[PDB]
Amino acid sequence: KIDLSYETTESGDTAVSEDSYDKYASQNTNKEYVCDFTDQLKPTESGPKVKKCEVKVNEPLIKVKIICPLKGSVEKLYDNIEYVPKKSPYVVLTKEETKLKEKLLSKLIYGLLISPTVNEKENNFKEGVIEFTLPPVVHKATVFYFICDNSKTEDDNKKGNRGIVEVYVEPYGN
Amino acid sequence: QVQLVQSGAEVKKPGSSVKVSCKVSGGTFNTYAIIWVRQAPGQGLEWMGAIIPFQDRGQYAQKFQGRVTITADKSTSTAYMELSSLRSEDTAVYYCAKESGRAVADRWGQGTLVTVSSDIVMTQSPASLALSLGERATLYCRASHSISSWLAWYQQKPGKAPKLLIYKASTLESGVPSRFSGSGSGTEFTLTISSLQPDDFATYYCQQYKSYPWTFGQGTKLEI
């Protein structure tokens, strides 16, 4: 199910505009594109920063893996970490008008594989990682998002960062 | 450093067509809404349409459907707005704007003058104002339906483009001095400046970005 009343923005409460995001390509090895936020979201003096991992796909059957550190995995570094949507990867965020709202990924990209588990654990951000595999044919350009936000975590005088995943799928196979 | 450069002013015979271009630079183009707002001479801001370029599909205001076309060339990072069946009342300064991950249109082009010669309601008071240096000014904004906290305040100097001052409902844009403040939620909101200074005398507008069509208060002028 989706929460039709949910609305957010890419910048969240950081007040940073997109031109000031730190933007990165996903880590890509063969047909596996990975966004590992474990280190990039840890508290730093300058924080909160926005850390945007761009998963740009123009090839078929790409597997995508996102890694959001769990609260408490390290003593104080992820105290207040939040992920969005809570039901990822079954639910994603897509831009409607100018705001982020929930969408069923299976409806958004027909044929997408969402395995129930990941390394025998639930394919949910509460187990620290989510995975899905894109199909061999995408007819229309599609952009969806995941949020892994540690910007409300304070350690020392340091503050965590807001992580954004943007999956930009170009048409292919047609 | 995001810049929006629009095509030059043009004069068009009634009934013809005009296409205004707008190059976006310094900011991601394909995945952020490019928005088009016009302002007729000595009047208020009017929302025309918007497009997230990768979708290749413009959403337009009912007034213009059948007459406008908002396109976007991803390869040149340029948006185009074409308005047909021109009339004398299409005379106005047309603006392109883009959002930057915060929903509000926070980056604005310089404006393009077009001359033709041969839904939520936002209510803003005071309609005009005049206050001395140092005094406090309190503007108001009403909405027919609740816009939650998605309300923005702009400052338009003469011959310039609207400048964002506050977004969400109290969040200050970067570089805006701390004398500005915003409060409110639902249908009633307020803007408040603490110490009027020389640069503060301009026209002010509120704007709901809860839902398309975005709509603007008729404006509150501030005079010396």
Next chain:
Amino acid sequence: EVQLVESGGGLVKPGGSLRLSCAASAFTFSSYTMNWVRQAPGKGLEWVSSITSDSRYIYYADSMKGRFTISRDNAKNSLSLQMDSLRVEDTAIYYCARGDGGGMAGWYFDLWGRGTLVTVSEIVLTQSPATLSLSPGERVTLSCRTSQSIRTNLAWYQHKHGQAPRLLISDASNRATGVPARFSGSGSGTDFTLTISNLEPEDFAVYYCQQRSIWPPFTFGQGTKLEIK
């Protein structure tokens, strides 16, 4: 065996402009992230800028944004650094370096040039000791402390005077190709060590650590000066 050769350095007066160029050979330039690193006189290495293979991602050090511009011509196997409104503090040796990655995980600098001298007239890595003098045949351990934990995302470099920096170890414990087994790395989190046994007079050099996981900027240690006597 020099595979990156920087050019365009030399003297420039304050407020002037230079354009450095790096010519690459022996590898496929077009498929690697390229970087600029610099070393002010008497200081350590400092990352300047990075550009991925397809130029989609460009990164700058905050103190150099707006004044320096990186670009690459893949058909010419060349790298460029435009330097404008130069300041006296931009005086340094500028090194061209190839990176072994291009994604959010960051990368190390696995191939370097000897550098060109330019004369104008947040994660902290703390290395120890600052200097030490040893005899050949002996064993030594160098330490690196990071202000934030980086798992095992550290690399170690050897810098002999007037030569190209050399990657010794990456991801904390993995020796680069060609590095003899007497170099070994260990540690994770915030505490890392480089151990060099069977010291040889050639190991008279400055050793730098580098973290790749919390960036930009990439940050180096201040260096450890090893005097073999």
